[PDB]
């Protein structure tokens, strides 16, 4: 009959969003992390999020479970899911539906035993699995009343662990354009915590260069440049108070960080040798290996999504050089031919909910009557067993 | 009674639309487009298989393939498929009011129009229909009862040679090569040039390319010494991505093959020496007259500058002394369709339909007692 | 769709296995009546008191076939009644007293009856395979891995 | 002296004289520039400014590798007239004017391309003869048939050609556009799936070299998911010539599982079985055993570990499924042998140099210098008139 709400977990590299169907914002982002020691016994002495957080030098250490967004240690993952759904979510597994997301390109075990936890040691009613892009897509467009739907675009997800370009094209993901880079938030707030180390600042905890990036860093459009503009300009060298533990008044004084961070999304040498082709020419390429019929409409809605992509000027230089490159090619081919053309253009679109447009298109999805016939209920699980869902369905097909 | 329907199934095109009109009420692509992708979207209501212009919209993902292979149907499910489309979407009247018409080709496996009857009846209960060839309407649509018509369109093309009242079945020609063969051809020689086009949305790509830009050369031998000079033969397309293409001789190469067959490996006379072969063989009695007018009808024979060259063509095989025009109406693509609306609307057909009450105790091969 | 429906199955018949062992001379009839003659005769031995002779007895003739599943059944069941029906102290000089065929017969019984333990007693099963083995060596195992399936 | 064959593959470069077996030389396309990474660099002896060859793929470390040839046709002409000229003056030091050369070409490239390097090698070489060939009549020369359909699957493009009796069919010539490359890049993407990520230069090659050690065709899909699915034995090693070890499990058989279906690359056309299918029977009814009874496959990608049989198996089944319609009784009628000889990859080589001297002695049989010269490109049409 009348079902309960859905529930919207959401489990990043570096903050989880829980939350409810139909809600207007998520009930707790708190980070991915639990608390673990090394006449409670040890099993149950775990704290997750804030209070993680604030607990760090009582007695307890620190672990991710999700790191590049997949999951390596099992055991913190499970704690982590029954510390959040008894402790802060409050609701009992076995009378709600559950919409699980984990980022595409994991291995179809990683999908197993997420199945198997859930199903094992919660037993809930039904999981479903959706990709963390899709949702982005979802949560694109505003005013989605009826019939106002792009259902064709591109996604842009940068977050904390790992970034994706996605392309959509009438509602179906296309396998075979998927490419993803290895860097996100974490790699670059390393970088900052490098850059802070070699200044030799007064303090350089890694919460201080994430709060650095939070009121600090901004897109640049050129390195060169932007360091002959900061040489001559002397109010772009500000001294963030720091106020770490009991360093009062310890100002750090930041400097070319503040440029020199978000060009590795433009510039990803500067990270690691693991990835050398720049933001823009990958998502060129990504469009390019698109079929032929739907390049339109992806150049035309590129959405953006994550916490990684709210830096100042982000849009406007990844639009810049996207535009700049089509442009090149496209009079390339006009003066191979010697005809003009109306040209393609290019808007790079950014909404009032970036930060978490992932939690809110999987909430907007989780409203539909149909949503609940996709789930895997718990007769089919206990049918075919706990290889359910193992086949990788969004990108590639299967055998 | 309250109207009547026409539906000319053509092997590339639908042209379903009410009698005594002459502009089609829905033309449309017959492709039944099914996505090749796994990764589906939750929500927005997107179906399993997409028909008629929504295919077109959305060849950017499916995979399109016509359900009727050189005029005859080898897919029956989404032949019908396509009929449900059209009966409840761009038609929007139950069939079970309305009695239907269909086109066939001639020389057509019967099995074929059995099992088209067959279905009709069984799942969709019209009340009356027929069958018959796209000749007759062509020549209806003129209004004489006089000519040869060369009806060529996506899957075959044929000759029906007829006079006043009776036709000459012994004189009827028919030849596979039509729009798609020539499509084929088109990417085959595409391929010289650099650009690439292999999926079936590539393939209704070069398909709005050759709709755009081809023509037939009046003599192939001088048009290709011109072609040593890039200069009126060059033009340009416009690629949905945004690319652009540079077309060459290709723009005449591609059309030639109606009259030079050979130029695909087919061994078979061009459709000029098809034309004069089954004139050929009736009689003097008749073929004094039947020179003179010669129909031209379908989607193929819409191609600019192709009647010319037919007309001095069979002149040339003609004896010197003949008098021969070519009937180039402007209306031609639809011609069958305005000829099937004309011969509906006379009140002297409604003695001869196939209704139910008759089908019940004749069966399926009353089709053949009938119409021809 | 055309890559299921699989054809190498018929177009090159692969080897069955009367292909590979001898076939069966004896016909069923006349291997049932012999299974039926043999049968009473151990159960006989067992009542008297000279379960030894009683297998011997048995042991002497040893039917097979795919066809035969019922006067087998009848069969193992008596040698596993007339197997369990002897004192553990006396084994060792009824295997050294046995040649090599027969042993590997009395193996390969007492294993196909470690194969249904819902109806049979399997520690007296187990114990003989644990004194036979220590006694003439693993060829016999060998022997039973190298048999024939309808054994 | 002896008519000099060049086999310009997209992968790989073969050269060699008439009456040779073997290829005298073979060596990837490639040229290579320098550059400095976050790398050792031991030098080792020298860095040269253009360095290509076997000295390019031994350095390969230091340098970066471009290909000029993609998808069987050349893309930047200037690095393949270095590739000509490194060929030509060390690779064989003997660098004559007036000598024959025998080039090829895959079928249904663009007239530009061969028009142009008929051109270069005219000019900037002086070679006084020349003739360009599809690889697939080397391929049946290969063999020494004279009727039959052979399958030519190579780094950049696979094509197929049938010929029945000393004619080919140029009406019904094939081109699949995937090949060994498009492969390569799907076994980089899966195991991009487990985490090993390869985006350097010499990284291509190191996947490529594994993709040759370690992957297999599979015979039966089904049963492949299973042993993947329930059993560890395929599980393999490889130890990067880094000297880092990765695991590679049903990436194996996923590897080459794009050529039978191209849809996993994105591939809208029909996989290779179909493929040979829809052409054979595009042909006419009479010469259809002749084009099933002898099918050759050929090239350097034809190599993988249970082709053959996965193909005749396939070729047999589509036709029980496709013309049977399901009847069984009719299966036992029918003759299909797929040839499979040992030197498939160099069966192009074997054939330009048979056609070498098989046409040799007769300059009236091919395109001269000075013919070349006065008529200009449209010269090249002595050669071959096919589609
Ligand atoms: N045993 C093998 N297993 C798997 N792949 C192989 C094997 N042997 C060769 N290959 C593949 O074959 C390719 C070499 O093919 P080759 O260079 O002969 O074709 P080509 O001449 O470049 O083709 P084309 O003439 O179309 O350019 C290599 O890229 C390699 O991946
Ligand atoms: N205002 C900001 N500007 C730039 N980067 C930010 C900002 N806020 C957060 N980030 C970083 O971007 C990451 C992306 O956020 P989120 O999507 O919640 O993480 P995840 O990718 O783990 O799901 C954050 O974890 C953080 O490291
Ligand atoms: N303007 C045009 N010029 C040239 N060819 C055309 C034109 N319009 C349509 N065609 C060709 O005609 C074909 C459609 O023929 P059609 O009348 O539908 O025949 P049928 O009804 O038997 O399918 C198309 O495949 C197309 O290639
Ligand atoms: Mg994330
Ligand atoms: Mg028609
Ligand atoms: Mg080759």
Same mark, same amino acid.
């Given at each position: 009959?009348?079902?309960?709400?859905?529930?919207?977990?959401?489990?990043?590299?570096?903050?989880?969003?829980?939350?409810?169907?139909?809600?207007?914002?998520?009930?707790?982002?708190?980070?991915?992390?639990?608390?673990?020691?090394?006449?409670?016994?040890?099993?149950?002495?775990?704290?997750?999020?804030?209070?993680?957080?604030?607990?760090?030098?009582?007695?307890?250490?620190?672990?991710?479970?999700?790191?590049?967004?997949?999951?390596?240690?099992?055991?913190?993952?499970?704690?982590?899911?029954?510390?959040?759904?008894?402790?802060?979510?409050?609701?009992?597994?076995?009378?709600?539906?559950?919409?699980?997301? $984990?980022?595409?390109?994991?291995?179809?075990?990683?999908?197993?035993?997420?199945?198997?936890?859930?199903?094992?040691?919660?037993?809930?009613?039904?999981?479903?699995?959706?990709?963390?892009?899709?949702?982005?897509?979802?949560?694109?467009?505003?005013?989605?009343?009826?019939?106002?739907?792009?259902?064709?675009?591109?996604?842009?997800?940068?977050?904390?662990?790992?970034?994706?370009?996605?392309?959509?094209?009438?509602?179906?993901?296309?396998?075979?354009?998927?490419?993803?880079?290895?860097?996100?938030?974490?790699?670059?707030?390393?970088?900052?915590?490098?850059?802070?180390?070699?200044?030799? $600042?007064?303090?350089?905890?890694?919460?201080?260069?994430?709060?650095?990036?939070?009121?600090?860093?901004?897109?640049?459009?050129?390195?060169?440049?932007?360091?002959?503009?900061?040489?001559?300009?002397?109010?772009?060298?500000?001294?963030?108070?720091?106020?770490?533990?009991?360093?009062?008044?310890?100002?750090?004084?930041?400097?070319?960080?503040?440029?020199?961070?978000?060009?590795?999304?433009?510039?990803?040498?500067?990270?690691?040798?693991?990835?050398?082709?720049?933001?823009? $020419?990958?998502?060129?390429?990504?469009?390019?290996?698109?079929?032929?019929?739907?390049?339109?409409?992806?150049?035309?809605?590129?959405?953006?999504?994550?916490?990684?992509?709210?830096?100042?000027?982000?849009?406007?230089?990844?639009?810049?050089?996207?535009?700049?490159?089509?442009?090149?090619?496209?009079?390339?081919?006009?003066?191979?031919?010697?005809?003009?053309?109306?040209?393609?253009?290019?808007?790079?679109?950014?909404?009032?909910?970036?930060?978490?447009?992932?939690?809110?298109?999987?909430?907007?999805?989780?409203?539909?009557?149909?949503?609940?016939?996709?789930?895997?209920?718990?007769?089919?699980?206990?049918?075919?067993?706990?290889?359910?869902?193992?086949?990788?369905?969004?990108?590639?097909?299967?055998? | 009674?309250?109207?009547?329907?026409?539906?000319?199934?053509?092997?590339?095109?639908?042209?379903?639309?009410?009698?005594?009109?002459?502009?089609?009420?829905?033309?449309?692509?017959?492709?039944?487009?099914?996505?090749?992708?796994?990764?589906?979207?939750?929500?927005?209501?997107?179906?399993?298989?997409?028909?008629?212009?929504?295919?077109?919209?959305?060849?950017?993902?499916?995979?399109?393939?016509?359900?009727?292979?050189?005029?005859?149907?080898?897919?029956?499910?989404?032949?019908?498929?396509?009929?449900?489309?059209?009966?409840?979407?761009?038609?929007?009247?139950?069939?079970?009011?309305?009695?239907?018409?269909?086109?066939?080709?001639?020389?057509?496996?019967?099995?074929?129009?059995?099992?088209?009857?067959?279905?009709?009846?069984?799942?969709?209960?019209?009340?009356?229909?027929?069958?018959?060839?796209?000749?007759?309407?062509?020549?209806?649509?003129?209004?004489?009862?006089?000519?040869?018509?060369?009806?060529?369109?996506?899957?075959?093309?044929?000759?029906?040679?007829?006079?006043?009242?009776?036709?000459?079945?012994?004189?009827?020609?028919?030849?596979?090569?039509?729009?798609?063969?020539?499509?084929?051809?088109?990417?085959?020689?595409?391929?010289?040039?650099?650009?690439?086009?292999?999926?079936?949305?590539?393939?209704?790509?070069?398909?709005?390319?050759?709709?755009?830009?081809?023509?037939?050369?009046?003599?192939?031998?001088?048009?290709?010494?011109?072609?040593?000079?890039?200069?009126?033969?060059?033009?340009?397309?416009?690629?949905?991505?945004?690319?652009?293409?540079?077309?060459?001789?290709?723009?005449?190469?591609?059309?030639?093959?109606?009259?030079?067959?050979?130029?695909?490996?087919?061994?078979?006379?061009?459709?000029?020496?098809?034309?004069?072969?089954?004139?050929?063989?009736?009689?003097?009695?008749?073929?004094?007259?039947?020179?003179?007018?010669?129909?031209?009808?379908?989607?193929?024979?819409?191609?600019?500058?192709?009647?010319?060259?037919?007309?001095?063509?069979?002149?040339?095989?003609?004896?010197?002394?003949?008098?021969?025009?070519?009937?180039?109406?402007?209306?031609?693509?639809?011609?069958?369709?305005?000829?099937?609306?004309?011969?509906?609307?006379?009140?002297?057909?409604?003695?001869?339909?196939?209704?139910?009450?008759?089908?019940?105790?004749?069966?399926?091969?009353?089709?053949?007692?009938?119409?021809? | 769709?055309?890559?299921?429906?699989?054809?190498?199955?018929?177009?090159?018949?692969?080897?069955?296995?009367?292909?590979?062992?001898?076939?069966?001379?004896?016909?069923?009839?006349?291997?049932?009546?012999?299974?039926?003659?043999?049968?009473?005769?151990?159960?006989?031995?067992?009542?008297?008191?000279?379960?030894?002779?009683?297998?011997?007895?048995?042991?002497?003739?040893?039917?097979?076939?795919?066809?035969?599943?019922?006067?087998?059944?009848?069969?193992?069941?008596?040698?596993?009644?007339?197997?369990?029906?002897?004192?553990?102290?006396?084994?060792?000089?009824?295997?050294?007293?046995?040649?090599?065929?027969?042993?590997?017969?009395?193996?390969?019984?007492?294993?196909?009856?470690?194969?249904?333990?819902?109806?049979?007693?399997?520690?007296?099963?187990?114990?003989?395979?644990?004194?036979?083995?220590?006694?003439?060596?693993?060829?016999?195992?060998?022997?039973?891995?190298?048999?024939?399936?309808?054994? | 002296?002896?008519?000099?064959?060049?086999?310009?593959?997209?992968?790989?470069?073969?050269?060699?004289?008439?009456?040779?077996?073997?290829?005298?030389?073979?060596?990837?396309?490639?040229?290579?520039?320098?550059?400095?990474?976050?790398?050792?660099?031991?030098?080792?002896?020298?860095?040269?400014?253009?360095?290509?060859?076997?000295?390019?793929?031994?350095?390969?470390?230091?340098?970066?590798?471009?290909?000029?040839?993609?998808?069987?046709?050349?893309?930047?002409?200037?690095?393949?007239?270095?590739?000509?000229?490194?060929?030509?003056?060390?690779?064989?030091?003997?660098?004559?004017?007036?000598?024959?050369?025998?080039?090829?070409?895959?079928?249904?490239?663009?007239?530009?391309?061969?028009?142009?390097?008929?051109?270069?090698?005219?000019?900037?070489?002086?070679?006084?003869?020349?003739?360009?060939?599809?690889?697939?009549?080397?391929?049946?020369?290969?063999?020494?048939?004279?009727?039959?359909?052979?399958?030519?699957?190579?780094?950049?493009?696979?094509?197929?050609?049938?010929?029945?009796?000393?004619?080919?069919?140029?009406?019904?010539?094939?081109?699949?556009?995937?090949?060994?490359?498009?492969?390569?890049?799907?076994?980089?993407?899966?195991?991009?799936?487990?985490?090993?990520?390869?985006?350097?230069?010499?990284?291509?090659?190191?996947?490529?070299?594994?993709?040759?050690?370690?992957?297999?065709?599979?015979?039966?899909?089904?049963?492949?998911?299973?042993?993947?699915?329930?059993?560890?034995?395929?599980?393999?090693?490889?130890?990067?010539?880094?000297?880092?070890?990765?695991?590679?499990?049903?990436?194996?058989?996923?590897?080459?599982?794009?050529?039978?279906?191209?849809?996993?690359?994105?591939?809208?056309?029909?996989?290779?079985?179909?493929?040979?299918?829809?052409?054979?029977?595009?042909?006419?009814?009479?010469?259809?055993?002749?084009?099933?009874?002898?099918?050759?496959?050929?090239?350097?990608?034809?190599?993988?570990?249970?082709?053959?049989?996965?193909?005749?198996?396939?070729?047999?089944?589509?036709?029980?499924?496709?013309?049977?319609?399901?009847?069984?009784?009719?299966?036992?009628?029918?003759?299909?042998?797929?040839?499979?000889?040992?030197?498939?990859?160099?069966?192009?080589?074997?054939?330009?140099?048979?056609?070498?001297?098989?046409?040799?002695?007769?300059?009236?049989?091919?395109?001269?210098?000075?013919?070349?010269?006065?008529?200009?490109?449209?010269?090249?049409?002595?050669?071959?008139?096919?589609?």
């Amino acid at each position: 009959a009348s079902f309960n709400v859905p529930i919207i977990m959401d489990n990043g590299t570096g903050y989880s969003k829980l939350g409810y169907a139909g809600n207007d914002a998520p009930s707790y982002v708190f980070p991915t992390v639990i608390a673990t020691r090394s006449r409670a016994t040890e099993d149950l002495d775990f704290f997750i999020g804030n209070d993680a957080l604030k607990k760090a030098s009582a007695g307890y250490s620190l672990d991710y479970p999700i790191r590049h967004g997949q999951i390596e240690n099992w055991d913190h993952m499970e704690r982590f899911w029954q510390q959040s759904l008894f402790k802060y979510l409050r609701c009992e597994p076995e009378d709600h539906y559950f919409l699980l997301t $984990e980022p595409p390109l994991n291995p179809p075990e990683n999908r197993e035993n997420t199945a198997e936890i859930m199903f094992e040691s919660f037993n809930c009613a039904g999981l479903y699995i959706a990709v963390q892009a899709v949702l982005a897509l979802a949560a694109s467009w505003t005013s989605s009343k009826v019939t106002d739907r792009s259902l064709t675009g591109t996604v842009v997800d940068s977050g904390d662990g790992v970034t994706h370009i996605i392309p959509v094209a009438e509602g179906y993901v296309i396998g075979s354009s998927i490419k993803t880079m290895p860097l996100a938030g974490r790699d670059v707030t390393y970088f900052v915590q490098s850059l802070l180390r070699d200044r030799n $600042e007064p303090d350089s905890s890694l919460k201080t260069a994430e709060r650095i990036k939070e009121e600090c860093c901004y897109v640049c459009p050129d390195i060169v440049k932007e360091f002959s503009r900061f040489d001559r300009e002397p109010d772009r060298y500000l001294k963030y108070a720091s106020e770490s533990i009991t360093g009062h008044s310890t100002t750090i004084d930041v400097g070319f960080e503040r440029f020199l961070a978000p060009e590795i999304f433009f510039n990803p040498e500067i990270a690691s040798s693991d990835f050398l082709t720049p933001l823009p $020419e990958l998502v060129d390429n990504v469009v390019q290996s698109s079929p032929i019929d739907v390049r339109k409409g992806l150049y035309k809605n590129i959405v953006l999504s994550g916490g990684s992509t709210l830096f100042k000027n982000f849009g406007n230089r990844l639009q810049r050089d996207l535009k700049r490159i089509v442009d090149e090619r496209i009079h390339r081919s006009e003066m191979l031919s010697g005809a003009k053309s109306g040209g393609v253009d290019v808007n790079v679109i950014s909404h009032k909910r970036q930060r978490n447009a992932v939690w809110f298109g999987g909430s907007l999805l989780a409203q539909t009557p149909e949503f609940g016939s996709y789930c895997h209920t718990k007769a089919d699980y206990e049918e075919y067993g706990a290889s359910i869902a193992r086949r990788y369905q969004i990108f590639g097909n299967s055998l | 009674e309250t109207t009547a329907l026409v539906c000319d199934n053509g092997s590339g095109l639908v042209k379903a639309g009410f009698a005594g009109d002459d502009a089609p009420r829905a033309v449309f692509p017959s492709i039944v487009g099914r996505p090749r992708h796994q990764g589906v979207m939750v929500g927005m209501g997107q179906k399993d298989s997409y028909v008629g212009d929504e295919a077109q919209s959305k060849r950017g993902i499916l995979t399109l393939k016509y359900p009727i292979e050189h005029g005859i149907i080898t897919n029956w499910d989404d032949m019908e498929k396509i009929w449900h489309h059209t009966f409840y979407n761009e038609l929007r009247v139950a069939p079970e009011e309305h009695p239907t018409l269909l086109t066939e080709a001639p020389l057509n496996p019967k099995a074929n129009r059995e099992k088209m009857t067959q279905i009709m009846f069984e799942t969709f209960n019209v009340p009356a229909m027929y069958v018959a060839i796209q000749a007759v309407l062509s020549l209806y649509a003129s209004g004489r009862t006089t000519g040869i018509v060369l009806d060529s369109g996506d899957g075959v093309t044929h000759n029906v040679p007829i006079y006043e009242g009776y036709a000459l079945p012994h004189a009827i020609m028919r030849l596979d090569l039509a729009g798609r063969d020539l499509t084929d051809y088109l990417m085959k020689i595409l391929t010289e040039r650099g650009y690439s086009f292999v999926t079936t949305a590539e393939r209704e790509i070069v398909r709005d390319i050759k709709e755009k830009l081809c023509y037939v050369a009046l003599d192939f031998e001088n048009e290709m010494a011109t072609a040593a000079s890039s200069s009126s033969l060059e033009k340009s397309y416009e690629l949905p991505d945004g690319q652009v293409i540079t077309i060459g001789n290709e723009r005449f190469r591609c059309p030639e093959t109606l009259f030079q067959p050979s130029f695909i490996g087919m061994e078979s006379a061009g459709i000029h020496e098809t034309t004069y072969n089954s004139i050929m063989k009736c009689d003097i009695d008749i073929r004094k007259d039947l020179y003179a007018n010669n129909v031209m009808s379908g989607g193929t024979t819409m191609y600019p500058g192709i009647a010319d060259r037919m007309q001095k063509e069979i002149t040339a095989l003609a004896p010197s002394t003949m008098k021969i025009k070519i009937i180039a109406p402007p209306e031609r693509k639809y011609s069958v369709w305005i000829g099937g609306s004309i011969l509906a609307s006379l009140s002297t057909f409604q003695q001869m339909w196939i209704t139910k009450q008759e089908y019940d105790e004749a069966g399926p091969s009353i089709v053949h007692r009938k119409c021809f | 769709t055309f890559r299921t429906l699989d054809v190498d199955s018929i177009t090159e018949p692969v080897l069955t296995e009367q292909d590979i062992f001898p076939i069966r001379n004896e016909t069923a009839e006349q291997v049932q009546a012999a299974v039926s003659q043999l049968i009473p005769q151990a159960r006989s031995a067992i009542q008297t008191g000279n379960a030894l002779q009683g297998l011997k007895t048995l042991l002497s003739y040893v039917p097979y076939g795919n066809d035969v599943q019922e006067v087998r059944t009848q069969y193992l069941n008596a040698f596993v009644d007339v197997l369990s029906n002897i004192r553990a102290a006396d084994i060792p000089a009824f295997v050294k007293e046995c040649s090599t065929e027969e042993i590997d017969n009395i193996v390969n019984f007492i294993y196909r009856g470690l194969a249904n333990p819902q109806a049979y007693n399997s520690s007296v099963l187990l114990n003989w395979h644990e004194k036979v083995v220590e006694i003439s060596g693993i060829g016999c195992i060998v022997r039973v891995l190298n048999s024939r399936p309808d054994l | 002296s002896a008519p000099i064959v060049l086999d310009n593959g997209t992968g790989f470069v073969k050269v060699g004289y008439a009456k040779d077996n073997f290829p005298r030389f073979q060596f990837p396309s490639i040229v290579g520039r320098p550059i400095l990474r976050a790398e050792e660099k031991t030098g080792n002896v020298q860095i040269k400014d253009v360095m290509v060859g076997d000295e390019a793929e031994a350095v390969r470390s230091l340098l970066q590798v471009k290909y000029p040839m993609e998808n069987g046709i050349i893309r930047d002409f200037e690095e393949m007239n270095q590739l000509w000229d490194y060929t030509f003056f060390e690779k064989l030091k003997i660098d004559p004017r007036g000598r024959k050369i025998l080039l090829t070409e895959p079928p249904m490239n663009p007239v530009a391309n061969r028009e142009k390097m008929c051109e270069t090698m005219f000019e900037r070489y002086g070679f006084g003869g020349v003739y360009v060939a599809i690889q697939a009549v080397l391929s049946l020369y290969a063999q020494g048939l004279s009727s039959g359909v052979v399958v030519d699957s190579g780094d950049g493009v696979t094509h197929i050609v049938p010929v029945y009796e000393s004619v080919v069919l140029n009406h019904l010539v094939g081109r699949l556009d995937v090949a060994g490359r498009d492969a390569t890049r799907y076994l980089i993407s899966l195991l991009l799936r487990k985490g090993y990520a390869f985006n350097r230069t010499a990284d291509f090659e190191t996947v490529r070299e594994m993709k040759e050690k370690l992957c297999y065709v599979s015979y039966d899909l089904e049963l492949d998911h299973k042993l993947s699915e329930e059993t560890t034995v395929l599980m393999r090693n490889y130890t990067l010539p880094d000297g880092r070890v990765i695991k590679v499990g049903s990436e194996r058989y996923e590897c080459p599982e794009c050529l039978f279906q191209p849809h996993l690359v994105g591939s809208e056309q029909p996989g290779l079985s179909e493929f040979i299918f829809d052409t054979i029977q595009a042909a006419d009814v009479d010469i259809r055993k002749y084009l099933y009874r002898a099918i050759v496959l050929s090239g350097g990608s034809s190599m993988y570990a249970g082709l053959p049989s996965r193909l005749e198996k396939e070729i047999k089944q589509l036709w029980f499924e496709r013309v049977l319609h399901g009847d069984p009784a009719r299966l036992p009628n029918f003759k299909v042998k797929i040839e499979d000889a040992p030197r498939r990859r160099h069966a192009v080589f074997i054939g330009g140099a048979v056609l070498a001297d098989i046409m040799a002695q007769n300059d009236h049989m091919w395109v001269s210098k000075a013919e070349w010269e006065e008529y200009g490109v449209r010269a090249l049409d002595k050669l071959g008139p096919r589609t």
